Nucleic acid binder design. Sequence first.
RNA 1: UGGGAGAGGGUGGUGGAAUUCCCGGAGUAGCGGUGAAAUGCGCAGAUACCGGGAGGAACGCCGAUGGCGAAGGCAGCCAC
RNA 2: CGCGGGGUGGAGCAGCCUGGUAGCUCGUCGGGCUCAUAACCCGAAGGUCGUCGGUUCAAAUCCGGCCCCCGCAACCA
RNA 3: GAGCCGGUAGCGGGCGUGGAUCCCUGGAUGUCCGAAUGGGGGAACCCGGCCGGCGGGAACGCCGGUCACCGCGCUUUUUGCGCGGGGGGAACCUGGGGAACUGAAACAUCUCAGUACCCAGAGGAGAGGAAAGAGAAAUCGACUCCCUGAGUAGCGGCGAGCGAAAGGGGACCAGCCUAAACCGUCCGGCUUGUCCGGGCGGGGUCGUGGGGCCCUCGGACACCGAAUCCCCAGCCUAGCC
RNA 4: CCCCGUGGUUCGUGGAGCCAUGGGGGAAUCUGGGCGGACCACCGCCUAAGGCUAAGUACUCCGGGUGACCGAUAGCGCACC
RNA 5: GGAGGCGUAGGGAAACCGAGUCCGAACAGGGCGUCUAGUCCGCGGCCGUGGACCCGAAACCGGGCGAGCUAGCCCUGGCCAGGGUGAAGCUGGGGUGAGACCCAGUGGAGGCCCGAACCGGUGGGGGAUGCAAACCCCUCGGAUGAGCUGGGGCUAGGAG
RNA 6: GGCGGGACCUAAGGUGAAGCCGAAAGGCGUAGCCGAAGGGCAGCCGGUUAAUAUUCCGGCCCUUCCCGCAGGUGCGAUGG
RNA 7: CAGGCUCUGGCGACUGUUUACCAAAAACACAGCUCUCUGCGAACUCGUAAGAGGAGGUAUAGGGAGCGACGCUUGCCCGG
RNA 8: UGGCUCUUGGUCGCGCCUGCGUAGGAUAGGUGGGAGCCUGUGAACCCCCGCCUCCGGGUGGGGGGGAGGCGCCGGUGAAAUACCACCCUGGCGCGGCUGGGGGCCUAACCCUCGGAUGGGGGGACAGCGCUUGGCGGGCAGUUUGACUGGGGCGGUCGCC
RNA 9: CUGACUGCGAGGCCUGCAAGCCGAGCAGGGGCGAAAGCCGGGCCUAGUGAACCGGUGGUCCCGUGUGGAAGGGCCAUCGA
Lengths: 145, 88
Amino acid sequence: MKVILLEPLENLGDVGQVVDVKPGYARNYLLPRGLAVLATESNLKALEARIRAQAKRLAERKAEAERLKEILENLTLTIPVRAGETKIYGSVTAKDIAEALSRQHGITIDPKRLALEKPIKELGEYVLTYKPHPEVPIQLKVSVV
Amino acid sequence: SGKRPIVANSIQRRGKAKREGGVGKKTTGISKRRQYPNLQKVRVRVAGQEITFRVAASHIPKVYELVERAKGLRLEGLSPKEIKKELL
RNA sequence: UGGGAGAGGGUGGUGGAAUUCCCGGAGUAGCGGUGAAAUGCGCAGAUACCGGGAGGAACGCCGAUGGCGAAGGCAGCCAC
RNA sequence: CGCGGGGUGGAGCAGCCUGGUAGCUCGUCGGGCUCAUAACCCGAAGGUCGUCGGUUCAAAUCCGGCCCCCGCAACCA
RNA sequence: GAGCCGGUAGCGGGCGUGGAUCCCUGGAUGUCCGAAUGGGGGAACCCGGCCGGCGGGAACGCCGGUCACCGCGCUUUUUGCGCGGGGGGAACCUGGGGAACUGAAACAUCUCAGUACCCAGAGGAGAGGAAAGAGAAAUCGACUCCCUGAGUAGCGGCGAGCGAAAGGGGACCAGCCUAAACCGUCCGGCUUGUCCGGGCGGGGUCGUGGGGCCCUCGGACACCGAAUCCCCAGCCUAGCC
RNA sequence: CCCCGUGGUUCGUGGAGCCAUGGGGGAAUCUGGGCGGACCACCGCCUAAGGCUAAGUACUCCGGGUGACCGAUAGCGCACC
RNA sequence: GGAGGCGUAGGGAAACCGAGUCCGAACAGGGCGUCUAGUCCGCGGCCGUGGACCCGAAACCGGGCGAGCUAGCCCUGGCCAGGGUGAAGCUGGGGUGAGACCCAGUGGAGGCCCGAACCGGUGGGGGAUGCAAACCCCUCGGAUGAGCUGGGGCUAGGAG
RNA sequence: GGCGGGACCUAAGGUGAAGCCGAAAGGCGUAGCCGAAGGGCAGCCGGUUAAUAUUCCGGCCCUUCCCGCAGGUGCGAUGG
RNA sequence: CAGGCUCUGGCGACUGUUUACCAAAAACACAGCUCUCUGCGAACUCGUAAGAGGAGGUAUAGGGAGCGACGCUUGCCCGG
RNA sequence: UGGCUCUUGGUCGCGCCUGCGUAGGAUAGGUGGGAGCCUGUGAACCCCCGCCUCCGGGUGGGGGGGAGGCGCCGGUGAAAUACCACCCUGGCGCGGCUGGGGGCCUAACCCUCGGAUGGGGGGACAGCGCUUGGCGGGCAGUUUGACUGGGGCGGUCGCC
RNA sequence: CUGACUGCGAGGCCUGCAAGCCGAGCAGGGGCGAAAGCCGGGCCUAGUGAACCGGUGGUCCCGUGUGGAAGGGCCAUCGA
Ligand SMILES: [Mg+2]
Ligand SMILES: [Mg+2]
Ligand SMILES: [Mg+2]
Ligand SMILES: [Mg+2]
Ligand SMILES: [Mg+2]
Ligand SMILES: [Mg+2]
Ligand SMILES: [Mg+2]
Ligand SMILES: [Mg+2]
Ligand SMILES: [Mg+2]
Ligand SMILES: [Mg+2]
Ligand SMILES: [Mg+2]
Ligand SMILES: [Mg+2]
Ligand SMILES: [Mg+2]
Ligand SMILES: [Mg+2]
Ligand SMILES: [Mg+2]
Ligand SMILES: [Mg+2]
Ligand SMILES: [Mg+2]
Ligand SMILES: [Mg+2]
Ligand SMILES: [Mg+2]
Ligand SMILES: [Mg+2]
Ligand SMILES: [Mg+2]
Ligand SMILES: [Mg+2]
Ligand SMILES: [Mg+2]
Ligand SMILES: [Mg+2]
Ligand SMILES: [Mg+2]
Ligand SMILES: [Mg+2]
Ligand SMILES: [Mg+2]
Ligand SMILES: [Mg+2]
Ligand SMILES: [Mg+2]
Ligand SMILES: [Mg+2]
Ligand SMILES: [Mg+2]
Ligand SMILES: [Mg+2]
Ligand SMILES: [Mg+2]
Ligand SMILES: [Mg+2]
Ligand SMILES: [Mg+2]
Ligand SMILES: [Mg+2]
Ligand SMILES: [Mg+2]
Ligand SMILES: [Mg+2]
Ligand SMILES: [Mg+2]
Ligand SMILES: [Mg+2]
Ligand SMILES: [Mg+2]
Ligand SMILES: [Mg+2]
Ligand SMILES: [Mg+2]
Ligand SMILES: [Mg+2]
Ligand SMILES: [Mg+2]
Ligand SMILES: [Mg+2]
Ligand SMILES: [Mg+2]
Ligand SMILES: [Mg+2]
Ligand SMILES: [Mg+2]
Ligand SMILES: [Mg+2]
Ligand SMILES: [Mg+2]
Ligand SMILES: [Mg+2]
Ligand SMILES: [Mg+2]
Ligand SMILES: [Mg+2]
Ligand SMILES: [Mg+2]
Ligand SMILES: [Mg+2]
Ligand SMILES: [Mg+2]
Ligand SMILES: [Mg+2]
Ligand SMILES: [Mg+2]
Ligand SMILES: [Mg+2]
Ligand SMILES: [Mg+2]
Ligand SMILES: [Mg+2]
Ligand SMILES: [Mg+2]
Ligand SMILES: [Mg+2]
Ligand SMILES: [Mg+2]
Ligand SMILES: [Mg+2]
Ligand SMILES: [Mg+2]
Ligand SMILES: [Mg+2]
Ligand SMILES: [Mg+2]
Ligand SMILES: [Mg+2]
Ligand SMILES: [Mg+2]
Ligand SMILES: [Mg+2]
Ligand SMILES: [Mg+2]
Ligand SMILES: [Mg+2]
Ligand SMILES: [Mg+2]
Ligand SMILES: [Mg+2]
Ligand SMILES: [Mg+2]
Ligand SMILES: [Mg+2]
Ligand SMILES: [Mg+2]
Ligand SMILES: [Mg+2]
Ligand SMILES: [Mg+2]
Ligand SMILES: [Mg+2]
Ligand SMILES: [Mg+2]
Ligand SMILES: [Mg+2]
Ligand SMILES: [Mg+2]
Ligand SMILES: [Mg+2]
Ligand SMILES: [Mg+2]
Ligand SMILES: [Mg+2]
Ligand SMILES: [Mg+2]
Ligand SMILES: [Mg+2]
Ligand SMILES: [Mg+2]
Ligand SMILES: [Mg+2]
Ligand SMILES: [Mg+2]
Ligand SMILES: [Mg+2]
Ligand SMILES: [Mg+2]
Ligand SMILES: [Mg+2]
Ligand SMILES: [Mg+2]
Ligand SMILES: [Mg+2]
Ligand SMILES: [Mg+2]
Ligand SMILES: [Mg+2]
Ligand SMILES: [Mg+2]
Ligand SMILES: [Mg+2]
Ligand SMILES: [Mg+2]
Ligand SMILES: [Mg+2]
Ligand SMILES: [Mg+2]
Ligand SMILES: [Mg+2]
Ligand SMILES: [Mg+2]
Ligand SMILES: [Mg+2]
Ligand SMILES: [Mg+2]
Ligand SMILES: [Mg+2]
Ligand SMILES: [Mg+2]
Ligand SMILES: [Mg+2]
Ligand SMILES: [Mg+2]
Ligand SMILES: [Mg+2]
Ligand SMILES: [Mg+2]
Ligand SMILES: [Mg+2]
Ligand SMILES: [Mg+2]
Ligand SMILES: [Mg+2]
Ligand SMILES: [Mg+2]
Ligand SMILES: [Mg+2]
Ligand SMILES: [Mg+2]
Ligand SMILES: [Mg+2]
Ligand SMILES: [Mg+2]
Ligand SMILES: [Mg+2]
Ligand SMILES: [Mg+2]
Ligand SMILES: [Mg+2]
Ligand SMILES: [Mg+2]
Ligand SMILES: [Mg+2]
Ligand SMILES: [Mg+2]
Ligand SMILES: [Mg+2]
Ligand SMILES: [Mg+2]
Ligand SMILES: [Mg+2]
Ligand SMILES: [Mg+2]
Ligand SMILES: [Mg+2]
Ligand SMILES: [Mg+2]
Ligand SMILES: [Mg+2]
Ligand SMILES: [Mg+2]
Ligand SMILES: [Mg+2]
Ligand SMILES: [Mg+2]
Ligand SMILES: [Mg+2]
Ligand SMILES: [Mg+2]
Ligand SMILES: [Mg+2]
Ligand SMILES: [Mg+2]
Ligand SMILES: [Mg+2]
Ligand SMILES: [Mg+2]
Ligand SMILES: [Mg+2]
Ligand SMILES: [Mg+2]
Ligand SMILES: [Mg+2]
Ligand SMILES: [Mg+2]
Ligand SMILES: [Mg+2]
Ligand SMILES: [Mg+2]
Ligand SMILES: [Mg+2]
Ligand SMILES: [Mg+2]
Ligand SMILES: [Mg+2]
Ligand SMILES: [Mg+2]
Ligand SMILES: [Mg+2]
Ligand SMILES: [Mg+2]
Ligand SMILES: [Mg+2]
Ligand SMILES: [Mg+2]
Ligand SMILES: [Mg+2]
Ligand SMILES: [Mg+2]
Ligand SMILES: [Mg+2]
Ligand SMILES: [Mg+2]
Ligand SMILES: [Mg+2]
Ligand SMILES: [Mg+2]
Ligand SMILES: [Mg+2]
Ligand SMILES: [Mg+2]
Ligand SMILES: [Mg+2]
Ligand SMILES: [Mg+2]
Ligand SMILES: [Mg+2]
Ligand SMILES: [Mg+2]
Ligand SMILES: [Mg+2]
Ligand SMILES: [Mg+2]
Ligand SMILES: [Mg+2]
Ligand SMILES: [Mg+2]
Ligand SMILES: [Mg+2]
Ligand SMILES: [Mg+2]
Ligand SMILES: [Mg+2]
Ligand SMILES: [Mg+2]
Ligand SMILES: [Mg+2]
Ligand SMILES: [Mg+2]
Ligand SMILES: [Mg+2]
Ligand SMILES: [Mg+2]
Ligand SMILES: [Mg+2]
Ligand SMILES: [Mg+2]
Ligand SMILES: [Mg+2]
Ligand SMILES: [Mg+2]
Ligand SMILES: [Mg+2]
Ligand SMILES: [Mg+2]
Ligand SMILES: [Mg+2]
Ligand SMILES: [Mg+2]
Ligand SMILES: [Mg+2]
Ligand SMILES: [Mg+2]
Ligand SMILES: [Mg+2]
Ligand SMILES: [Mg+2]
Ligand SMILES: [Mg+2]
Ligand SMILES: [Mg+2]
Ligand SMILES: [Mg+2]
Ligand SMILES: [Mg+2]
Ligand SMILES: [Mg+2]
Ligand SMILES: [Mg+2]
Ligand SMILES: [Mg+2]
Ligand SMILES: [Mg+2]
Ligand SMILES: [Mg+2]
Ligand SMILES: [Mg+2]
Ligand SMILES: [Mg+2]
Ligand SMILES: [Mg+2]
Ligand SMILES: [Mg+2]
Ligand SMILES: [Mg+2]
Ligand SMILES: [Mg+2]
Ligand SMILES: [Mg+2]
Ligand SMILES: [Mg+2]
Ligand SMILES: [Mg+2]
Ligand SMILES: [Mg+2]
Ligand SMILES: [Mg+2]
Ligand SMILES: [Mg+2]
Ligand SMILES: [Mg+2]
Ligand SMILES: [Mg+2]
Ligand SMILES: [Mg+2]
Ligand SMILES: [Mg+2]
Ligand SMILES: [Mg+2]
Ligand SMILES: [Mg+2]
């Protein structure tokens, strides 16, 4: 019988797959113990939702990180800070960045996604990196003045 | 019996023993026999409680298939027998 | 009173050896048996050999020109 | 009638499969030996391998047909 | 329209043209039993719960209503509410089950026979019914029943027996609803999704195939019309000239 | 639909179809699918796996009508409690 | 009311042919068939299929009714005069190392004995259209047991 | 009201909610219920009628229930 | 009211049971012997089944068969 | 009617491989292509191993190694040995396909336990449904000839 | 040398039916003899079995709407 396993099963396969197993094995084990479900014409449909949804869901999430890819790449981030001769007065972390970035223009970004752990304590310009999408990063130009 | 989605009252028919050649001639010895329908028990969860089906071998899936249509149903509160009826 | 020797007797328990049987392992044409041979046993897998198990009976060497008891009779081993 | 197994010395069997080997037991005759049969030991005659036929260098062997026995399930107006 | 208080007189006592008896129609009353049903039970008996009533009535008794069970819907569950069933019926009918004698001059196939009988179910009927038909006619056109086809075709220890249809002639004549595609709604499931499926409503019903969604048509006034509903004609339930 | 076991039909295994279904395998949606007596081709027929349907037909407990039907051993078992 | 039926053509299994046709190569022979004949109704004789002149089994099969008789069992009651015999055990004494065992007394066992009720029915007689579809008289067996018996209950037709 | 039976109990057996099986009819069966010469249960002597009598009458004796009351106590069940 | 007795043989040990209504026996039953099945959801029995009995028993138990107290004893033949 | 795992037979193509009576140099499985060819796509010879086994040779992996290594033919025999083409006997490896065998499991199914949406035991067995064959007077229907100095036993039954 | 021929058959024996039995002559074709002529088995009278069921070969036939196949009929012959 055709079934839909919603659980990493050794011999069978990973979640969401469709494999036909022996009747009993599914009628007295899988289905009963809540591992897979009788893949009827009904569930096959609701499965297409699982696919199409999650699909265009991250395909539109990567399509939105496509707008930040175009604008965050062709723009420099000038940060008006104080500094002695080489190193900075205050100190710029990932907040002083996503903050003055949301202000100087209005772009909404998280200091969490922004790939930087080092609390910038030197003056000059650098090339940061932001991670909106796992496979579509964006090098955010810096300019700590 | 046979009273389930199957509905297969075991009907009797003839069971005749024949001696012959087949391509030489043929004769017989007739009797009456009761042909029962292969019928097994099917226990299944179904919402709260459990539930048994004295169903046939043919219409086994029909049960679990029905259990599927049952998810689109609203039931609860001590429903041993009443589940079956309200179960189509 | 004090010591000793002993298969003296009865009870409960216990040890190894070996026989047969069954299981498992390996292996093949013969095994067995007599003066000789047959009956019998084995290609359905015997004999020979290896491992595990079951059971009963009798106790090798010590042991003898030996000991013990009334006679019959009494022997592996421990205790009563 | 259809299926498959074989016919091997006076007799049965191994050889057959996957051809280069007629051998084995007993009988029987002569020899050894014994009180005697026997055991046991030496040697020997007897088989176109049921038949006819084919392929091969050679056919008991592999194969076709023919004769017979034995086995098999089935059949009988 | 003159008598009457059944058969049925007698004993006894009454009633009727202020129109009885009698005949019809509707209503009332209808103990106890019996599907029996509050519970029990050996039918016509026995005991009881709750509300109300009667009696000095608390005991006790009586009276009136009420309380079986099963199904479907309502109750989100339990507890209640409504609709229905149960049982009987000469014969008839469909369905579920189903002999043997007997015959074959024996008997086992075959026969009797789907007969007898059993059981369940229906109703004034039942069954069946608009084609996944028939069958050889580029034919018929639901079903049922009568005649015919025909003791034919064919079936058969090819024995005994068994025995059909097409078609033709007549009776009567009727054709509809739905599931699914598709659109809308309320509920909970949940992996929460542009969905799953439940119910509901719109939609749709077919053989030259039909339907659905989209596009064009103007697409509606119209037409078809109840197997339902209302009225009435007539008609049966007493009589009169 | 196919096969195994059977019922119906005129059909008793028979060249055995068609209709039904107890067991098993197990599909498609008009380029679908059954059928016209094994089976193939060709030609034609018909749309299965939901339901409903008046009339014509059966019967006679019951009321009526009639009889080359009986007339009390007949005729229903019973003319009559 | 002509649907339908019989008849006006037969031969052959059939294809088919036709006053002919079948076998066969046949212009032989021969089998069958032409030379014309009917239908419809009434009545009567006989036959078929029906119960089929009339009366009669032993049987068989379906469904149902009975264990108030008879058999067994389940449940709960009841009954069994009187007499006899005298096991075990027990006690005392004897005995032995202790004991076995012995004796006496006590004791009251038993599908024990005899014998009524009670149950049954051996042998003879009668009875035989009986008092009676199994009785009567004499006689005889059991009689605390596998006993008899009341009431309640279960089991049945190839079944009990 | 007092004997016998029921408005008490249970026995085999029957019935039979639950539950199980059977082509139909039906078959099995826990609980409870039904079911008795068994368990529980308060009347003895005598008189009187043409006929009935622990039944009517006499004498002596007794039970259940309801209501009220005085006193005593954690009272109370289909459950132990 | 109220045994006639004795001796000897056959069968069956014995009390018991039977052919209501021609047979009470030498027949059957019996204690005890042997064989055989059965490891428990037992074998066997009734039922289509559910189930029940077996048995709220467990190989010293239960089913079947034969023989028939007790004593002595039970021989040879698996070819069918 | 299920999970896993060891094991084993069948089977289809393909990969690799065993098959030695003498003669001829030999150990030529069949018929043939073909005198050319294998080798730096590194050989002859050595060293280690799996395996067939006629007792001697062959074949695959790897390393040393460095330029050779085979053959027709004459020969002899039934035929010929560069390499190559296919196939036969039997074998090994691959996956498909399908069946047998054993062991463990738990969840179907069954049993069971102060009721459990659970725990324990059995376990893909059993039970049951369909189909297969068999045993099967426990039960059912039914046959069991006739002539005949009665029947039965005996003899006979057609033809000359 | 294969007349142990095919297609036939006037007539007649026998006889309840069915079955049995003789056969001139015709045609095709064939053997023997010069020919006439003979040959449709054996000097003759027993050496056998209706029908159904089916088998094997053959064939002008039938073939379920149509070509064809299955199946069948016909001639031959088989299993009492
Ligand atoms: Mg679908
Ligand atoms: Mg700037
Ligand atoms: Mg600045
Ligand atoms: Mg199934
Ligand atoms: Mg299936
Ligand atoms: Mg409800
Ligand atoms: Mg001292
Ligand atoms: Mg000592
Ligand atoms: Mg010892
Ligand atoms: Mg030897
Ligand atoms: Mg031997
Ligand atoms: Mg041997
Ligand atoms: Mg001595
Ligand atoms: Mg074969
Ligand atoms: Mg064989
Ligand atoms: Mg030999
Ligand atoms: Mg010799
Ligand atoms: Mg030979
Ligand atoms: Mg030869
Ligand atoms: Mg045979
Ligand atoms: Mg009067
Ligand atoms: Mg009045
Ligand atoms: Mg009136
Ligand atoms: Mg009235
Ligand atoms: Mg009643
Ligand atoms: Mg009521
Ligand atoms: Mg009141
Ligand atoms: Mg009261
Ligand atoms: Mg009341
Ligand atoms: Mg409800
Ligand atoms: Mg509510
Ligand atoms: Mg509701
Ligand atoms: Mg409710
Ligand atoms: Mg609801
Ligand atoms: Mg309501
Ligand atoms: Mg009602
Ligand atoms: Mg009714
Ligand atoms: Mg009714
Ligand atoms: Mg009727
Ligand atoms: Mg009927
Ligand atoms: Mg007859
Ligand atoms: Mg007879
Ligand atoms: Mg008959
Ligand atoms: Mg019959
Ligand atoms: Mg019939
Ligand atoms: Mg029927
Ligand atoms: Mg019927
Ligand atoms: Mg009815
Ligand atoms: Mg109708
Ligand atoms: Mg209908
Ligand atoms: Mg047709
Ligand atoms: Mg009419
Ligand atoms: Mg007719
Ligand atoms: Mg016949
Ligand atoms: Mg008939
Ligand atoms: Mg018939
Ligand atoms: Mg018929
Ligand atoms: Mg017609
Ligand atoms: Mg739907
Ligand atoms: Mg839908
Ligand atoms: Mg929606
Ligand atoms: Mg809808
Ligand atoms: Mg609508
Ligand atoms: Mg509509
Ligand atoms: Mg269309
Ligand atoms: Mg119009
Ligand atoms: Mg109009
Ligand atoms: Mg209008
Ligand atoms: Mg009007
Ligand atoms: Mg009128
Ligand atoms: Mg009227
Ligand atoms: Mg009038
Ligand atoms: Mg079909
Ligand atoms: Mg067809
Ligand atoms: Mg089916
Ligand atoms: Mg399967
Ligand atoms: Mg489509
Ligand atoms: Mg058709
Ligand atoms: Mg068809
Ligand atoms: Mg056809
Ligand atoms: Mg076509
Ligand atoms: Mg339809
Ligand atoms: Mg009429
Ligand atoms: Mg009248
Ligand atoms: Mg009348
Ligand atoms: Mg008259
Ligand atoms: Mg007159
Ligand atoms: Mg009369
Ligand atoms: Mg004709
Ligand atoms: Mg004809
Ligand atoms: Mg002819
Ligand atoms: Mg002529
Ligand atoms: Mg003429
Ligand atoms: Mg004429
Ligand atoms: Mg004429
Ligand atoms: Mg005439
Ligand atoms: Mg005339
Ligand atoms: Mg007449
Ligand atoms: Mg006449
Ligand atoms: Mg006549
Ligand atoms: Mg007649
Ligand atoms: Mg008579
Ligand atoms: Mg008669
Ligand atoms: Mg009979
Ligand atoms: Mg009785
Ligand atoms: Mg008494
Ligand atoms: Mg007394
Ligand atoms: Mg006494
Ligand atoms: Mg005394
Ligand atoms: Mg004494
Ligand atoms: Mg003493
Ligand atoms: Mg003493
Ligand atoms: Mg003493
Ligand atoms: Mg003493
Ligand atoms: Mg003494
Ligand atoms: Mg003593
Ligand atoms: Mg004494
Ligand atoms: Mg004493
Ligand atoms: Mg005394
Ligand atoms: Mg006594
Ligand atoms: Mg006595
Ligand atoms: Mg008596
Ligand atoms: Mg008597
Ligand atoms: Mg006597
Ligand atoms: Mg006498
Ligand atoms: Mg006696
Ligand atoms: Mg006595
Ligand atoms: Mg009694
Ligand atoms: Mg009864
Ligand atoms: Mg009361
Ligand atoms: Mg009870
Ligand atoms: Mg009951
Ligand atoms: Mg009962
Ligand atoms: Mg009970
Ligand atoms: Mg009762
Ligand atoms: Mg009772
Ligand atoms: Mg009492
Ligand atoms: Mg008193
Ligand atoms: Mg008086
Ligand atoms: Mg008084
Ligand atoms: Mg007071
Ligand atoms: Mg307290
Ligand atoms: Mg208290
Ligand atoms: Mg207290
Ligand atoms: Mg307290
Ligand atoms: Mg207290
Ligand atoms: Mg003597
Ligand atoms: Mg005796
Ligand atoms: Mg006796
Ligand atoms: Mg004895
Ligand atoms: Mg004796
Ligand atoms: Mg008795
Ligand atoms: Mg008795
Ligand atoms: Mg008696
Ligand atoms: Mg008697
Ligand atoms: Mg007597
Ligand atoms: Mg006696
Ligand atoms: Mg007896
Ligand atoms: Mg006896
Ligand atoms: Mg004995
Ligand atoms: Mg049974
Ligand atoms: Mg039981
Ligand atoms: Mg029990
Ligand atoms: Mg019990
Ligand atoms: Mg025993
Ligand atoms: Mg005896
Ligand atoms: Mg004896
Ligand atoms: Mg013995
Ligand atoms: Mg003996
Ligand atoms: Mg002897
Ligand atoms: Mg034997
Ligand atoms: Mg033997
Ligand atoms: Mg399996
Ligand atoms: Mg299986
Ligand atoms: Mg499977
Ligand atoms: Mg399987
Ligand atoms: Mg395997
Ligand atoms: Mg292997
Ligand atoms: Mg493989
Ligand atoms: Mg040489
Ligand atoms: Mg050499
Ligand atoms: Mg190359
Ligand atoms: Mg190396
Ligand atoms: Mg190295
Ligand atoms: Mg190398
Ligand atoms: Mg190298
Ligand atoms: Mg080297
Ligand atoms: Mg050359
Ligand atoms: Mg190979
Ligand atoms: Mg595979
Ligand atoms: Mg596979
Ligand atoms: Mg296993
Ligand atoms: Mg295990
Ligand atoms: Mg475990
Ligand atoms: Mg386990
Ligand atoms: Mg478990
Ligand atoms: Mg476990
Ligand atoms: Mg299952
Ligand atoms: Mg249990
Ligand atoms: Mg469990
Ligand atoms: Mg296993
Ligand atoms: Mg199985
Ligand atoms: Mg069978
Ligand atoms: Mg037997
Ligand atoms: Mg018999
Ligand atoms: Mg038999
Ligand atoms: Mg008969
Ligand atoms: Mg016969
Ligand atoms: Mg006779
Ligand atoms: Mg004669
Ligand atoms: Mg005579
Ligand atoms: Mg010539
Ligand atoms: Mg003749
Ligand atoms: Mg001539
Ligand atoms: Mg001649
Ligand atoms: Mg002759
Ligand atoms: Mg002759
Ligand atoms: Mg021809
Ligand atoms: Mg031809
Ligand atoms: Mg034709
Ligand atoms: Mg033919
Ligand atoms: Mg022959």
